[PDB]
Amino acid sequence: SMQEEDTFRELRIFLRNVTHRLAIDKRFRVFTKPVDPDEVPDYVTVIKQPMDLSSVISKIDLHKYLTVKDYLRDIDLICSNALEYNPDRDPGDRLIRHRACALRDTAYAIIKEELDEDFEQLCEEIQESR
Numbered sequence: 001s002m003q004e005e006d007t008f009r010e011l012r013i014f015l016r017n018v019t020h021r022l023a024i025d026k027r028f029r030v031f032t033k034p035v036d037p038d039e040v041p042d043y044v045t046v047i048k049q050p051m052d053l054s055s056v057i058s059k060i061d062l063h064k065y066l067t068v069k070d071y072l073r074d075i076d077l078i079c080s081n082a083l084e085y086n087p088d089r090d091p092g093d094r095l096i097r098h099r100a101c102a103l104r105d106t107a108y109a110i111i112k113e114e115l116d117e118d119f120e121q122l123c124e125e126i127q128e129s130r
């Protein structure tokens, strides 16, 4: 209905704002764009489902997220991909892992503090009805 499309539009506005706040944080610059296979040839082979904050924005605008949980699955994927691609004890690996965990924690904390539980429940019930 018109009421339901208003609800999903509010969700998209909220997700764009959260994603923007993540993307402008200097700690998360390595997660803002897709991995250029020129610079990192082994990435496209080791990571089967790449995800980054620019791809998240595109999915928002394609109406791919109908719930905050759908969004957080892609935030979680950015994080899990980084942990999988950076398993070594080397400080370059440890730095990216730390930033990945901070990206995930930051997104979850913003959503916990700023997204009303009843709004997320409404999104889920509209989604489960389709």
Ligand SMILES: C[C@@H](N)C(=O)Nc1nc2c(s1)CCCC2=O
Pocket: 030, 031, 035, 081, 082, 083, 085, 086, 092, 093, 096
């Ligand atoms: C130092 C070495 N471990 C390194 O540069 N690792 C990198 N990891 C990632 C890069 S570079 C960009 C895409 C996301 C990602 O997980």
